Design a protein around this nucleic acid. Structure first.
Ligand SMILES: [Mg+2]
Ligand SMILES: [Zn+2]
Ligand SMILES: [Zn+2]
Ligand SMILES: [Zn+2]
Lengths: 93, 103, 49, 100, 56, 144
RNA sequence: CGCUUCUCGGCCUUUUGGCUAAGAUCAAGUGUAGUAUCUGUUCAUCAGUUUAAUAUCUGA
RNA sequence: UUAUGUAUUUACUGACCU
């Protein structure tokens, strides 16, 4: 044997996990990803509810996963129909 | 198949925003269907923020119709020269303009 | 005598440092100064005729 | 069953013939379709127990092994005092799977 | 015509006789080979579609 | 054919229930008799709405759940939150390592405390009588 | 009062440091019956149809 | 701003299934 040039591994490793634990970790990882991206975007309308789903709060729209929320940033422009609420906020420009 | 719907395009935009450019296995590690080859292929083929994916000009069309006569195939050699550069946006231009020069 | 930060593709160091700009990080990451020699034309139609 | 909503029961008068369940479905209740608390034997009609159809599974129509039962929750709701619970039609499952 | 697609699939399926094969790339390569087997006319129309109109 | 809420409200011995739709029934007098019979409960409020009975619970964020007190006096919430918080720090390396070399006795609380909490310390909750049907707000009208 | 320099604080990249061959590799799911939710998408006066009430047809 | 019709993913249900 090449004890030097064999593909190494460490003792007591426990091994690489099955598909269920791997893609559960993928969903938690992707949750942390989308949370930090909306934190960098400083979005004040992202809400996560009592069961791990996502809501456009001005929109009042539900979203199963992360890319269902952050692909709801383009349609149904209440995002600029808050110009009416800004006109109620201030009667001028 | 490589269908590339929107809920993976926007996650790819977030991943390239986080991880980087020459690091694709680490962002194919969160897409459940895609490999890193397909991630490179889309982010340089469709999602690159330098891609001017609309606005067909008039200077680039008179450019390409006697740039795709110099080297008649080869829309990956003349894609950076045109700079429309998606290499099939050029092929869209060339087939549309040879429909409109035929009708 | 000040230095820009590092906008690497692998860092594994202090700050990976993403502003909004400084993403292309080159001229355009590619240029060929005329991008084509014109003799291509003097070949191509020469075969065409 | 409750899972496949298009399965229809026989519902004729229950005779003296005791129902049977296949080896794949032993312990299943027939109506509520669970495993615990079996309380009451199954009596099936004479048309759904004739000749070739004797000792055959109530649900699957496979060869029966053990006797069939209702739950206590089917018993005290008196879902055993309706017709015979012999599932008649085979529809839209274990047919297309046979064609697959 | 089918008699040439069968040759191409044999000449490509020959490259997989050991089976410590890779994560996707060559498993999806032989997945493409056996999908070309189980419907030769689907692949044989895809070849003509690829072969008139795709040049990038 | 459909005599209106005026006369239909005039005929009935209890006119205080006849509504704007009860004229549009197919038998009005018995409908407002059974609507005014003694201990019935009414049709839910959302039979005429457009919102599928609870899709108005959109943007309000609510607390997770209050455990009842006899369960909280077993310490199960503190042990369970502690090991959830300790498990949120683990990587897949140690989540797969302590899948095959498991440390046990993480909770090991006792059996007498749990038996006492369900049997000695059982609390009757605050129930309600059979009329008090549920509508959509119903807990944000706590003003009564 | 104004101007330049110095020092203390209120502070807006700090990731575990470096180098090798990006160190090196990897990453399979079905079929069935049903729902929920995004995105795309569009929304002139009678008469009877219909509906709890409302909203198609026809009428000038 | 409730809402439709659809193209259309994503989630979810039934101890569904060799
Ligand atoms: Mg080692
Ligand atoms: Zn039962
Ligand atoms: Zn029968
Ligand atoms: Zn059976």
């Amino acid at each position: 044997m090449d004890f030097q040039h064999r593909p190494g591994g460490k003792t007591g490793s426990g091994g690489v996990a099955s598909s269920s634990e791997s893609n559960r970790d993928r969903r938690e990882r992707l949750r942390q990803l989308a949370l930090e991206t909306i934190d960098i975007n400083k979005d004040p309308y992202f809400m996560k509810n009592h069961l791990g789903s996502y809501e456009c709060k001005l929109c009042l729209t539900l979203h199963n996963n992360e890319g269902s929320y952050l692909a709801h940033t383009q349609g149904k422009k209440h995002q600029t129909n808050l110009a009416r609420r800004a006109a109620k906020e201030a009667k001028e420009a | 198949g490589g269908v590339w719907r929107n809920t993976e395009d926007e996650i790819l935009k977030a991943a390239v925003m986080k991880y980087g450019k020459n690091q694709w296995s680490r962002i194919a590690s969160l897409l459940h269907r895609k490999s890193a080859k397909q991630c490179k292929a889309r982010w340089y083929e469709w999602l690159d923020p330098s891609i001017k994916k609309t606005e067909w000009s008039r200077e680039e069309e008179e450019k390409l119709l006697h740039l795709a006569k110099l080297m008649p195939t080869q829309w990956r050699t003349i894609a950076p020269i045109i700079g429309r550069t998606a290499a099939q946006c050029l092929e869209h231009y060339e087939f549309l303009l040879d429909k409109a020069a035929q009708r | 005598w000040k230095i820009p930060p590092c906008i690497s593709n692998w860092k594994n160091a202090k700050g990976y440092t993403i502003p909004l700009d400084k993403r292309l990080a080159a001229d355009g990451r590619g240029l060929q100064t005329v991008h084509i020699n014109e003799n291509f034309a003097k070949l191509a139609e020469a075969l065409y005729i | 069953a409750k899972h496949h909503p298009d399965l229809i029961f026989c519902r004729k008068q229950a005779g003296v013939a005791i129902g049977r369940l296949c080896e794949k479905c032993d312990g299943k209740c027939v109506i509520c379709d669970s495993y615990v608390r079996p309380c009451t034997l199954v009596r099936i009609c004479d048309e759904c127990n004739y000749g070739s159809y004797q000792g055959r599974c109530v649900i699957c129509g496979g060869p029966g092994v053990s006797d069939a039962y209702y739950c206590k929750e089917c018993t005290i709701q008196e879902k055993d005092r309706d017709g015979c619970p012999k599932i008649v039609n085979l529809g839209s499952s274990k047919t297309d799977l046979f064609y697959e | 015509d089918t008699k040439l697609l069968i040759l191409a699939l044999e000449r490509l399926k020959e490259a997989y006789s050991v089976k410590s094969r890779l994560n996707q790339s060559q498993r999806e390569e032989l997945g493409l080979i056996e999908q070309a087997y189980d419907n030769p006319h689907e692949a044989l129309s895809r070849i003509k579609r690829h072969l008139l109109t795709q040049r990038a | 054919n459909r005599f209106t809420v005026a006369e239909l409200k005039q005929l009935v011995a209890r006119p205080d229930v006849v509504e704007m739709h009860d004229v549009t029934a197919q038998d009005p007098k018995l409908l407002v008799h059974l609507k005014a019979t003694r201990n019935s409960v009414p049709v839910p409020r959302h039979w005429c709405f457009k919102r599928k009975y609870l899709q108005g619970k959109r943007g309000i964020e609510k607390p997770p759940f209050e455990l009842p007190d006899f369960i909280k006096r077993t310490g199960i919430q503190e042990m369970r939150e502690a090991l959830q918080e300790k498990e949120e720090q683990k990587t897949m390396k140690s989540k797969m390592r302590e899948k095959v070399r498991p440390k046990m006795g993480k909770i090991d609380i006792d059996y007498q405390k749990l038996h006492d909490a369900f049997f000695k310390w059982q609390t009757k909750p605050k129930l309600t009588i059979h009329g008090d049907l549920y509508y959509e707000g119903k807990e944000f009208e706590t003003r009564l």
